Amino acid sequence: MSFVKETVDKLLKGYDIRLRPDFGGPPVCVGMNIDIASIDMVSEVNMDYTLTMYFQQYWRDKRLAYSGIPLNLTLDNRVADQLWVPDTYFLNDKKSFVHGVTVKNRMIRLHPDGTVLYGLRITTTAACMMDLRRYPLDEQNCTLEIESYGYTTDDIEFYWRGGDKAVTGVERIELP
């Protein structure tokens, strides 16, 4: 049972949080996944919309690679402050936060090959410009733009993990 403790201690030992996986190597490839919990309101007055989601990121990190433990480790969410994570951000957001009840709605999961799964529960108010000329017979196109803040394509690349099945819950969404 102490083998897991020694393994995680060895993994976190000598780990630089400021250095991306394969810092000098090819760019790190990050898969993304979203589960839309609810689109709360869609305000024509402010031309924005609130949206709650489970936002998950997958990336391979050789530093967090272990062996002899045939199971995926789900560690406490505080380890995210010690591990490296992408500097993702929503470009068109006006106000957003991570839910913090009962604890921070965050998740870190490691895999023996080195894969890291990083999940957050995010409520965000995104901007959606609206062509209300044909109101109420109008049709709007509201987008959410996800982008890396500091890194470029020479360092980080993005993709939708699972392809077109990377976003779920849309059929479940209901609006007034």
Partner: nanobody
């Protein structure tokens, strides 16, 4: 030499508000001549042709007019029109523009 080019747009013009004019002379690559917004204000011109050209807009017919007052013999080129998304990026880079036109030809 009063020349007025016209780029007419049809379809989902709202989703691609910004419209930009480019020019491609023989041999040279595409260069950013100008850009115009949706509401018609806040036009942006290049350094070379900042005062010579003027770009106007009228959403009542979905057309952008590129006027030219005084033309130089380095201006001979194929003039393109393009549309850009609301969160594409910079204006001076043709890659950010999604939908292009066949482009007209001007010689002087």
């Amino acid at each position: 030499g009063s020349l007025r080019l016209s780029c007419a747009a049809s379809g989902h013009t709202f989703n691609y508000p910004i419209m930009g004019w480019f020019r491609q002379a023989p041999g040279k690559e595409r260069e950013f001549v100008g850009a115009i917004s949706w509401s018609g204000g806040s036009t942006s011109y290049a350094d070379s042709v900042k005062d010579r050209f003027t770009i106007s807009r009228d959403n009542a017919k979905n057309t952008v007019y590129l006027e030219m007052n005084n033309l130089k013999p380095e201006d001979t080129a194929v003039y393109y029109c393009a549309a850009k998304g609301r969160y594409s990026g910079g204006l001076y880079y043709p890659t950010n523009y999604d939908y292009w036109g066949q482009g007209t030809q001007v010689t002087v």
